[PDB]
From Swiss-Prot, chain B:
Homotetramer. Residues 1-64 are annotated as: Calmodulin-binding. Residues 24-29 are annotated as: Mediates modulation by decavanadate and PIP2-binding. Phosphorylation by PKC leads to increase the sensitivity to Ca(2+). The modification Phosphoserine is found at S33, S40. Calcium-activated selective cation channel that mediates membrane depolarization. While it is activated by increase in intracellular Ca(2+), it is impermeable to it. Mediates transport of monovalent cations (Na(+) > K(+) > Cs(+) > Li(+)), leading to depolarize the membrane. It thereby plays a central role in cadiomyocytes, neurons from entorhinal cortex, dorsal root and vomeronasal neurons, endocrine pancreas cells, kidney epithelial cells, cochlea hair cells etc. Belongs to the transient receptor (TC 1.A.4) family. LTrpC subfamily. TRPM4 sub-subfamily. This is Transient receptor potential cation channel subfamily M member 4. Sino-atrial nodes (at protein level). Widely expressed. It is found in: Cell membrane; Endoplasmic reticulum; Golgi apparatus. Disruption phenotype: Mice have fewer dendritic cells in lymphoid organs and impaired migration of dendritic cells is seen. TRPM4, is a temperature-sensitive ion channel, it adopts distinct conformations at different temperatures, markedly influencing where and how ligands interact with it. Decavanadate (a positive modulator), ATP (an inhibitor) and Ca(2+) bind to different locations of TRPM4 at physiological temperatures or at lower temperatures.
Length: 967, 82, 98
């Protein structure tokens, strides 16, 4: 990053040559960054200077440019102006964000500006520095020989010998953020620098403030302090170039222009302020008085305070002020200018400043300007709506999406790739560009609030998974949690007023992006804290009971289910050939028909498998069974197909896979049975298949209220059982082969020793301990072997025929140590880990179950209400159909009811926030702060009254002297 | 790692160090106990101002009557103007 | 000539708290220097006579351990590969010890 800043800028000595002095610049002082400088030609253009600073080094666009001139007091300036330069210039350049352009050398007011910046940077933890830029001629730098080298991107270690001033060369400042060195080629005299200075000022003033641009042109102001005869050329060449000015009181060089603005005595004035060249200076100062529009006075002021309004006073005298208040990001100016009742503010100025507040990230001006009163249908042209999507950082996600959407003002395409009240378009706009305060405020004004909050939570999480950076994805997840909380609280108060009307609020068809109600919006968004309420679980209950009353006990439902003539009695109260479809239409009776038909399937499977299973030919009942599993097979194909993405939608789950597994083992059992030589193979495969059909019932009963969450929890305990199987198998091998080696039996078949290694001790931990098979004192001895040693004769056909008697006390000790470690350590440790895990995951498994409880109810609601032994009727009628291939005033009354409870919720939130203790502590801190702002006047008046009391008293002493003269 | 790899890495590290220290100082400055300190000091210097309000009132009471005694002497000068 | 590290070691040996925290906050190479600070204070804490000075050094060593945690927290939260190259860098302090 050094060769182009060597080449493109130039240096002339005359031959024009490429530059050699640039890059970083360190000083001896520690704790600071590297300053940046550049050796530059004079006869060049500042457009490449603006590109070099604002792009290559890295600097923001300014909001204000103040150039400070003066400096007749060389060694010491007054403390009054030092108070102004310390506070009242730097606080405005640090609040608005500004560039203070001065001379980069010490002479004149270069020191007093640099000391003021060092004082302000020390006096506060402002966490930033005022970008004070400096220009300087190349010829007058003291030690420039430590800067010459053309190598590049380097800290050039400047040195201060602390040498006193000669009128030939000067040292550099050390409080400026960047320095400019302009090569004129004279090395002799200050003055050939202001050509580049004034050209760079008018080029900065020519451009404008914004992100995509499109703002005010940057206001540039000149500050004049004491100065000399040489500055009147600079004033007149400035005011020719249409740049306003301001004048401090100061001393006589600027007071020359002050006296000429307050009003030959002219020749007097030109011969006691300058004392040299009267009449040429008289022509120049009258040239200044041609352009008195661009001139203000700073004398009768508070001092180092209220400077920003005086800057606006200078731009008003040299005249859009609301746009300057937005660009400075200062609320108090725009607020006070809207309280001024003289102007009669017109709407198009408000719409212009609104685009300045919406393109940039200033939410507080958006709230202020809309609260003044402003139309929005007359605001959002498609042109301005096109502009709002052009304030995009060019390396974000939305920039890629809008380019890809234009590849095939295209937001319906963008929302399709993811999924005059124009507030909703601004809500979607603020959600895509990831503004928090914009999107919350645009939610709080628009209508249709519950569904819009759920769509907001869905849209932010979908864009969070697709996001590159960890920081922007984490920030979007926090915004999505905010909107999920507001939908919770708003529906909380809407349900707390009226249960039927909130029930009609959730179940309303297509509020956002096609037919998807608020429950399916909460379904796709992982909104587990929305289904966890009281009202939503009540509405899932009322949906579950159909059109019955949800207070009917279960036994009355069973008694009416086995007595279809007992529907028409007073046991099932209705209303939260008619009652027939009322009873049999509810999802509890579709579920109850599922369970009764499935238990009769297991009873039929058990009667076939246990009692009558002929080896030759299938009986009647086995053929009823094969017809049954044929129907269940068509049921799972219907829940997989009712076109390749759907097969991934079937394969992804675990109980579509498990029911697939039970049917595949059923087909393998039939096909192995029907071959004549493989009868017993099918006889065992159907037994394992009956296990897999009966573990179905654990998934069917997750819908239920009491057995629900306790079935869900069991799968989250299987990590501790796997640990227990690990430690048990290590210890089972360790014990087993040791007792097998110590006493060696004589019957040494491979399955027999695997039995008496792995299958004795596993039954020993469940209380089945064989003692007669491994202990001499319980066996009968004898010479039953043909090998050296003593032997015994165990009991039982599996413990071998003979057992060595050698060291049988050690086998008794291994039995004791095994029973200790297994029945005491491991089992009681396992109860400890189940108690800890269950108390840890109980809350999360209730949040997970209450979310899944909706999709289970919706599954039973969208089922053909007919039993699986009778479900071929529905498959007939749907195969025939395969061979052929709220009112408006109801919505208005509902949504105004919703917006009323929205408004009461926001007033309650603001009152509870306002009366917290930290907000009280803020406001009292501010009130004491402005109270000490009052007490500066009490300090200033007391010395002023002390003079004024004695001034009349000296006149009363003079009146006493008049009484003394009255003698 | 090479030398310019170390320089680019350690300047990246020092950038995130500086943002961390600014965030710590802001979260400390806006705690309630620090606000309670600073308001206690500001009321304390406000009572340092109000010692001057007590001292000036008796000094103005003399000074208002001092010109008024001279205005009574001016009334005595008007009485001597007879 | 960045001599802040010599002042950091100087303040850690004489058991100053505010000196050593401030000298940490100006110097570079911050994560490894905080871990070396925590190591050096605990090693001098076990070798210490008085219960009071040893307890005070243990509280300072817990302070530097917390600052290394939070600094690497934000460095990892920005860029995973670049923080991965930050821990696994060869010999930052006192020979080859990452």
């Amino acid at each position: 990053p050094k060769i182009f800043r060597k080449k493109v800028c130039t240096t002339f000595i005359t031959t024009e040559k490429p530059t050699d002095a640039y890059g970083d610049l360190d000083f001896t002082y520690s704790g600071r960054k590297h300053s940046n400088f550049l050796r530059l030609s004079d006869r060049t253009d500042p457009a490449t200077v603006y590109s070099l600073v604002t792009r290559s080094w890295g600097f923001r666009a300014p909001n204000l440019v103040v150039s400070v001139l003066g400096g007749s007091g060389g060694p010491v300036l007054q403390t009054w102006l030092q108070d102004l330069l310390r506070r009242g210039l730097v606080r405005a350049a640090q609040s608005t964000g500004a560039w203070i352009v001065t001379g980069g050398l010490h002479t004149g007011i270069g020191r007093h500006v640099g000391v003021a910046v060092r004082d302000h940077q020390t006096a506060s933890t402002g966490s930033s520095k005022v970008v004070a830029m400096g220009v300087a001629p190349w010829g007058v730098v003291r030690n420039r020989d430590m800067l010459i080298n053309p190598k590049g991107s380097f800290p050039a270690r400047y040195r201060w010998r602390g040498d006193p001033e000669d009128g030939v060369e000067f040292p550099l400042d050390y409080n400026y953020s960047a320095f400019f060195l302009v090569d004129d080629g004279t090395y002799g005299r200050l003055g050939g620098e202001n050509r580049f200075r004034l050209r760079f000022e008018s080029y900065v003033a020519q451009q404008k403030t914004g992100v995509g641009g499109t703002g005010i042109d940057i206001p540039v102001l000149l500050l004049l302090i004491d100065g000399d005869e040489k500055m009147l050329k600079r004033i007149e060449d400035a005011t020719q170039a249409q740049l306003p000015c301001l004048l401090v009181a100061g001393s006589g060089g600027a007071a020359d222009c002050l006296v000429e603005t307050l009003e030959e005595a002219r020749d007097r004035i030109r011969r006691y302020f300058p004392k040299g060249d009267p009449e040429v200076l008289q022509a120049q100062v009258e040239r200044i008085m041609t352009r008195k529009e661009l001139l203000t006075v700073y004398s009768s002021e508070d001092g180092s305070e209220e400077f920003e309004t005086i800057v606006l006073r200078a731009l008003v005298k040299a005249c859009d002020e609301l746009r300057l208040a937005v660009a400075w990001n200062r609320v108090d100016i725009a607020q006070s200018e809207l309280f001024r009742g003289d102007i009669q503010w017109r709407s198009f100025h408000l719409e212009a400043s609104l685009m300045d507040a919406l393109l940039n990230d200033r939410p507080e001006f958006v709230r202020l300007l809309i609260s003044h009163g402003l139309s929005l249908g007359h605001f959002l042209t498609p042109v301005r709506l096109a502009q709002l999507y052009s304030a995009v950082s060019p390396n974000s996600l939305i920039r890629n999406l809008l380019d890809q959407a234009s590849h095939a003002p295209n937001v319906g395409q963008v929302l399709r790739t993811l999924l005059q009240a124009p507030w909703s378009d601004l809500l979607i706009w603020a959600l895509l560009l990831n503004r928090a305060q914009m999107a919350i405020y645009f939610w709080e004004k628009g209508s249709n609030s519950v569904a819009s909050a759920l769509g907001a939570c869905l849209l932010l999480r979908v864009m969070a998974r697709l996001e590159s950076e960890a920081e922007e994805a984490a920030r979007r997840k926090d915004l999505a949690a905010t909107f999920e909380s507001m939908s919770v609280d708003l529906f909380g108060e809407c349900y707390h007023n009226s249960e039927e009307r909130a029930a009609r609020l959730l179940l309303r068809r297509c509020p956002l992006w096609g037919e998807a109600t608020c429950l399916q919006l909460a379904m796709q968004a992982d909104a587990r804290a929305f289904f966890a309420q009281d009202g939503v679980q009540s509405l899932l209950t009322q949906k579950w009971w159909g059109e019955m009353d949800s207070t009917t006990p279960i036994w009355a439902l069973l008694l009416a289910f086995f007595c279809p003539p007992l529907i028409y009695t007073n046991l099932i109260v209705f209303r939260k050939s008619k009652r027939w479809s009322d009873f049999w239409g509810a999802p509890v009776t579709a579920f109850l028909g599922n369970v009764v038909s499935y238990l009769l399937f297991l009873l039929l499977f058990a009667h076939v498998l246990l009692v009558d299973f002929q080896p030759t030919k299938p009986s009647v009942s086995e053929l009823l069974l094969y017809f049954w599993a044929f129907t269940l097979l068509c049921e799972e194909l219907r829940q997989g197909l009712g076109l390749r993405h759907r097969l991934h939608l079937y394969l992804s789950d675990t109980w579509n896979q498990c029911d697939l597994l039970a049917l595949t083992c059923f087909l393998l059992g039939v096909g192995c049975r029907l071959t004549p030589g493989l009868f017993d193979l099918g006889r065992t495969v159907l037994c394992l298949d009956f296990m897999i059909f009966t573990l179905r019932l654990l998934h069917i009963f997750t819908v239920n209220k009491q057995l629900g969450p306790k079935i869900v929890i069991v799968s989250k305990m299987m990590k501790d059982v796997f640990f227990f199987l690990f430690f048990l198998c290590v210890w089972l091998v360790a014990y087993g082969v040791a007792t097998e080696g110590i006493l060696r039996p004589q019957d040494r078949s491979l399955p027999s020793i695997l039995r008496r290694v792995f299958y004795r001790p596993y039954l020993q931990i469940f209380g089945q301990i064989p003692q007669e098979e491994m202990d001499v004192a319980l066996m009968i001895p004898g010479n039953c072997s043909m090998e050296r040693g003593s032997w015994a004769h165990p009991e039982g056909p599996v413990a071998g025929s003979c057992v060595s008697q050698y060291a049988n006390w050690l086998v008794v000790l291994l039995l004791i140590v095994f029973l200790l470690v297994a029945n005491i350590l491991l089992l009681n440790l396992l109860i400890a880990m189940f108690s800890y895990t269950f108390s840890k995951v109980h809350g999360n498994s209730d949040l997970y179950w209450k979310a899944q409880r909706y999709s289970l109810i919706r599954e039973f609601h969208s089922r053909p209400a007919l039993a699986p032994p009778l479900i071929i009727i529905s498959h007939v009628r749907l195969l025939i159909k395969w061979l052929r291939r709220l009112s408006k005033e109801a919505e208005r009354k509902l949504l105004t009811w919703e917006s009323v409870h929205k408004e009461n919720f926001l007033l309650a939130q603001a009152r509870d926030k306002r009366d917290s203790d930290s907000e009280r502590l803020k406001r009292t801190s501010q009130k004491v702060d402005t109270a000490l702002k009052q007490l500066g006047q009490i300090r200033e008046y007391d010395r002023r009254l002390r003079g004024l009391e004695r001034e009349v008293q000296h006149c009363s002493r003079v009146l006493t002297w008049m009484a003394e003269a009255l003698s």
